[PDB]
């Protein structure tokens, strides 16, 4: 309620926005009370220690003036984990719990395999960082890794980052760049993504 | 078409995979409400995330793996327009793990079994 009724980034007090006050005040009093009751009742054990601590910071302006940017930084984290941790309550209803049990099996299996395949994406990340360095998406070694991770779902950006630069004569290593592109497409979108479908199909 | 001898098996299979998804969706609406109300904080300055309901219809359209990465994270970061750049890129790797990889493979795995 306190997310959909206040514009993100604006600071807010019990009086409303620092610039709906009864709704804002009562929903803050509720978030505060339920976070201190949460601290009393205290991956489920870890999620609660994110939620109640972060949900206090979003609402400290009930009592304590705090920066607008910090308030909403905790608003973003708290609201996310509040709903991820709401799935753990669906384990105990007869329509639902089968799916949360399956979600955990496929997630735990993926998170084991990432120990291996983080190095498969570090190979292409540090290598497109050489070959495509002149282009904004590959400007830095960490941007290059967040970019090959986003290519993993098969959105290679082919025309935008290989073909158009080649026809402008802006690839520094065109033959080697197109070889690393067919190689990435084989190992990652085809091979690695099918290995995760195969794992999921078995374990469900 | 359920009463023709080349067709009816496909309509029987379509209804099995649809009834399974339409059960599954009561759970995973909250998985998309988590990312929807969170990208509504972090990406608020951008047209696709302007409102909490537009943010949810956009998070739903990212589920098929078309994340709009360059257009919505990278280019705003290089312009210095992300309000929370580190936290925005963390929620991007998180969304891509939980939704396009995990949730979509869970629906393929369910469909492979039920067919």
UniProtKB/Swiss-Prot annotation, chain A:
Glycans are attached at residues 13, 19. It comes from the Eukaryota. It is found in: Cell membrane. The modification Cysteine sulfenic acid (-SOH) is found at residue 96. The chain crosses the membrane at residues 22-42, 43-63, 70-90, 103-132, 174-200. Ca(2+) binds at residues 42, 45, 48. TRPA1 activation by electrophiles occurs though covalent modification of specific cysteine residues in the N-terminal cytoplasmic domain. Hydroxylation is required for TRPA1 activity inhibition in normoxia. In hypoxia, the decrease in oxygen concentration diminishes the activity of the hydroxylase EGLN1, thus relieving TRPA1 from inhibition and ultimately leading to channel activation. Residues 64-69, 133-141, 163-173 are extracellular. Residues 142-162 dip into the membrane without crossing it. Residues 91-102 are cytoplasmic. The record marks 155 as: Crucial for calcium permeation. It is linked to Episodic pain syndrome, familial, 1: An autosomal dominant neurologic disorder characterized by onset in infancy of episodic debilitating upper body pain triggered by fasting, cold, and physical stress. The period of intense pain is accompanied by breathing difficulties, tachycardia, sweating, generalized pallor, peribuccal cyanosis, and stiffness of the abdominal wall. Affected individuals do not manifest altered pain sensitivity outside the episodes. Belongs to the transient receptor (TC 1.A.4) family. C-terminal helices from the four subunits associate to form atypical coiled coil structure; this region is probably involved in binding the inositol polyphosphates that are required for optimal channel activity (in vitro). Homotetramer. Interacts with TMEM100. Interacts with EGLN1. Interacts with the scorpion wasabi receptor toxin at the same site that electrophiles but in a non-covalent manner. Ligand-activated Ca(2+)-permeable, nonselective cation channel involved in pain detection and possibly also in cold perception, oxygen concentration perception, cough, itch, and inner ear function. Has a relatively high Ca(2+) selectivity, with a preference for divalent over monovalent cations (Ca(2+) > Ba(2+) > Mg(2+) > NH4(+) > Li(+) > K(+)), the influx of cation into the cytoplasm leads to membrane depolarization. Has a central role in the pain response to endogenous inflammatory mediators, such as bradykinin and to a diverse array of irritants. This is Transient receptor potential cation channel subfamily A member 1. It comes from Homo sapiens (Human). The gene is TRPA1.
Swiss-Prot record, chain B:
Changing residue 6 to S: In FEPS1; 5-fold increase in inward current when stimulated by the agonist cinnamaldehyde compared to wild-type at normal neuronal resting potential; consistent with a gain of function mutation. Ligand-activated Ca(2+)-permeable, nonselective cation channel involved in pain detection and possibly also in cold perception, oxygen concentration perception, cough, itch, and inner ear function. Has a relatively high Ca(2+) selectivity, with a preference for divalent over monovalent cations (Ca(2+) > Ba(2+) > Mg(2+) > NH4(+) > Li(+) > K(+)), the influx of cation into the cytoplasm leads to membrane depolarization. Has a central role in the pain response to endogenous inflammatory mediators, such as bradykinin and to a diverse array of irritants. Belongs to the transient receptor (TC 1.A.4) family. Residues 44-52, 74-84 are extracellular. The chain crosses the membrane at residues 14-43, 85-111. The gene is TRPA1. Homotetramer. Interacts with TMEM100. Interacts with EGLN1. Interacts with the scorpion wasabi receptor toxin at the same site that electrophiles but in a non-covalent manner. TRPA1 activation by electrophiles occurs though covalent modification of specific cysteine residues in the N-terminal cytoplasmic domain. It comes from Homo sapiens (Human). The lineage of its organism: Eukaryota, Metazoa, Chordata, Craniata, Vertebrata. Residues 53-73 dip into the membrane without crossing it. Changing residue 60 to A/T: Loss of inhibition by A-967079, AP-18, and ASD. Increase in activation by cinnamaldehyde, AITC and acrolein. Residues 2-13 are cytoplasmic. It comes from the Eukaryota. The record marks 66 as: Crucial for calcium permeation. It is linked to Episodic pain syndrome, familial, 1: An autosomal dominant neurologic disorder characterized by onset in infancy of episodic debilitating upper body pain triggered by fasting, cold, and physical stress. The period of intense pain is accompanied by breathing difficulties, tachycardia, sweating, generalized pallor, peribuccal cyanosis, and stiffness of the abdominal wall. Affected individuals do not manifest altered pain sensitivity outside the episodes. The modification Cysteine sulfenic acid (-SOH) is found at residue 7. C-terminal helices from the four subunits associate to form atypical coiled coil structure; this region is probably involved in binding the inositol polyphosphates that are required for optimal channel activity (in vitro). This is Transient receptor potential cation channel subfamily A member 1. It is found in: Cell membrane.
